[PDB]
């Protein structure tokens, strides 16, 4: 007999925004092989020279005075830096606002401004590879300044506001393919810049309604392609930083299946050579091409094509110091059960006669990314799910014929399993972060000794908070269906008892090409609810989850809805067969694409066990893929315009007809830029036709990602305050 | 052993939309001294005479096969019939559609057409007063045809789509002040037409979002002058039906405080002289003016003004056949409690030295509208509130010094005790209709014998249905605060039991010049919920409502909402003393302006007696009157643009701040043009900042007047479903 009270306060709503839980990552980047940038720890920014415990104050409590410049970065000369803050701060991935130049010693603000124009907003500044040369993007125009005090030079200015995007990515590139906003890349020599110019005039335009703006609010118009519409028309240009600065346009290939090209990847192969990944409009035919920036001569080095589509076309080709044989990562057949994503080798100049396909790694697992390759001998470092899909571990292999894989850390202090590392220019030291399943562990390590030769950032306060609050028990119960094994992640409220029945939630994302069951450390509304309300949560990554086989990924190609619905529902079936789960209170949640799923999965099982969930909800739930971005629609459903009959069954209406007793809900901001309000509007219309019971909460004229702490706090509060009633008996 | 069965079934929403409760009112109109239209009640169109039960079917039941024309009007010569079908209403009265002309007996339907154009949608056609002459308004252009066989001829075409209106009303001149879409007047002889030209060029424009139209739904722009904006430029023009049809325009007076004006009332004095009412922008000066058509010159007749505002702007004076003294209705002091609305005599040509004002009526009551004046006698027939403000009865005063208002209707029927009458050209024969609280009756009568020859429509189905189900018993309970009187209405399902407790739902409308506590028979969601769900619903006409004193109207100048809030909370506190009613379950409802009330009456009384309303709700509420039409904001809260500071204290936002835990609902269609959705969006923003629980529903791209049955039943089902789980414990 024992009691074991363990009376510690349950996690409240504010805990996610409590400074104790305010996880800090310096996000160090190797300035050289002997030191890293060592950004803000708790204020001043030092330069912790990794050689021998030496820290030099490069930045001090001075950016606090400069109107709280959110972002900061120092030029390669380490002598003049740029600070940047925001006025009317919009950054979902936008990152606009004010830029300022400043001095390395201290103080000295300097408004980096467009020529002939005073202090004004700037899109992006960045740094060059050499000395203090910088650029800045004003109203879709790239201007360059080799010297900090040098008068601005209009390198290119033909870009137009919302019409021509050169030096920055438009919304489709900012959200669907590049997933990054910067569309310029410096050459290795710091003399040339390769950028992308996008014409958007032919692109169809939508207008987001506005209410809260003014007494006569007007719609914000911008281009937003859809299925069967006109995609942005991109071109690739190269312009020098000095002298003539000639613009050179690179010719894409003219294959019969190469109708329209997406620039999924472009990188300087050398100071004059460049490697570009060009994908067909159907997103099922990719071509890796090697071109010459100063010459413009293009020649293909590889080509791949898949029946369904190509995944992770954002490959990063890591090159040698002189354009010698380099590395790549791609899907090799790997026999049965999916052409797994493994590493591959390319020679310096692969002849058109044959390819250099050389799987450095082989096995039923995938490499998430290639970390780095260093030329003294044979060392490729990378992150992979080799040990387990739900974990990202560090691995190293050798480029010489031995091809021997090797772990580096394989667990460290306080239960760390998840890994993510980053090497320097010359292997001298590499950073490593845990971010799971414990507190993130910012650390330095040395390639030879492989030892933590000083603690970088541990966040002991986070451990104190996690031991001072009822952090819910983490559990795993891998499931298996048909010809695949599906991960899972059930949670228990740390006061659980097998005798006491407890309610259940299913959290679903199911994004095609991503994963939800990961050992990354995270605290969100689910953690609070399992703490504040004590309901188990289920995270099942059904068919189409990433890093689990290309065949599994393509299982849902043009077959959305049903398969993932089957997986999530069968996860619910598996959870109900226990004695600690009461059928009275079982709920679901979703968001973004998962919102779709969060709506698609409310049918009746059998006849006695109908109305599978008492309550459900969604957030920004995509419902019609015709009304969503073309780069996404055509990817998983093919090109429109020819009536492919791949959209009628995709509409969630077909499933929402029943809605017998489920207490549904929708939360959707008015001014959503990713998933338009039209999706919620159509769903509500269909619901009205079906005459169902639901409630709606709205955010008037707000962005999609909730980049305001008040917005996120209110959102999590609303979700909790919604599940409380339907989980109360 | 067998007692068989008893008891009658209660009332459910399905009953409302069953055919049983439909009030098939024919709405007959006195064509001549001894005949009325006797329009459709259960099919065919039949003409009747008062002499001896004369039956004359003019049109068969062919409207069903005539594409189910929504409306029809016979030609004034009783020779042609105009059918209106395929109507797509946009406002309350903008029934744009298709018009087809046909011969009186039957056969040969002919589609009215614009010149040189085939069948197309028509804004309005109408009929003339004599012969077969007609007009029609197409794309804001008035064309006329004296001869039906004669094709369309151009008459006036200055109109522009949404900018220039000829003979019709814009939104402001349809819904706020003129309260109808009729802006054209036929001369008694059918020789000239008087039409209003509305210029919207300087009127600001607002877009209403569309969320359902197509792949890229676009906003709808229309001219909605907000508070502190420029009202449309209205001019009056008289045109001839023959010859050159040279236009002549009316010249308004030029008092220094009436430059910006509304033509709030204009009625033909004769076939060439007219009386027109100009109400200035501050609506504090209303000049009645006599104009001659052939010269275009307007001669001033009289002026009216008040310490707060003018009222009853569309009471058309009745001009005698000789143009002698017309008996208009103006605010005479009538002792205390403000200047009651009593009849004023005005001679044909009153001397400028002194007018011929004469208070025909008198008493602690007023006249709602004046039917006619028997030129062959000292009899003037009208409808007035002589008995009670909540009942209207027919009366006949003496235009000469007799001044005897006779007891004609005056409770001549046992049940309704509430009346509405309409006389002929000779006023010998008149139609009478009860319209509550009993089942409405339509009856013929003569003013000589005051005898009921036969009932025109008895609503037999309505009577049997009102006897079928357990009706809610009607009750009344006057209240008084200070020197103000306020009626009240309350219902019970008539199967009330004192032991069982029932909750209270408070319904408010509260708009100036209205009467929520009325003895009108009606079937709605209120009685359905009272019957089936067992609740008692209270209506209390607070301060600011009309028909009970010009002072009791005008005291709310710039203080619109607070006084009626005090009246309603007094009603709550003085009604919750019942031993069969409880403080736990108290709920409120609101609509349009009442939504503000439904939100403005939820504080926490003191500190202990909080939780005033358990589950409140509202429809299209208004919180910031700046975002609303100037003709309502300025008219009661003071003119906008001057920062009256009533536009910063009449916001319920600071009032809805507390709302600590009370659940609340909002319902608002997307395409609302009564109270723009911006009000709801701002309210939601405040609530998110206020951090209070709320719910919401949406109707995408739906007008405010609920022009469909399915939408109406969905709304009623949704509101009753909201209330049913918010009452039961």
Residue numbers in the entry:
A (entry chain I), B (entry chain J): 59 to 787
Original authors' sentences:
Native Kv4 tetrameric channels form macromolecular ternary complexes with two auxiliary β-subunits—intracellular Kv channel-interacting proteins (KChIPs) and transmembrane dipeptidyl peptidase-related proteins (DPPs)—to evoke rapidly activating and inactivating A-type currents, which prevent the backpropagation of action potentials. Thus, our data suggest that two distinct modes of modulation contribute in an additive manner to evoke A-type currents from the native Kv4 macromolecular complex.
Owing to the flexible position of the large extracellular domains of DPP6S floating above Kv4.2, the overall resolutions are 4.2 Å and 4.5 Å for the Kv4.2–DPP6S and Kv4.2–DPP6S–KChIP1 complexes, respectively. In the extracellular region, two DPP6S dimers float above the channel core.
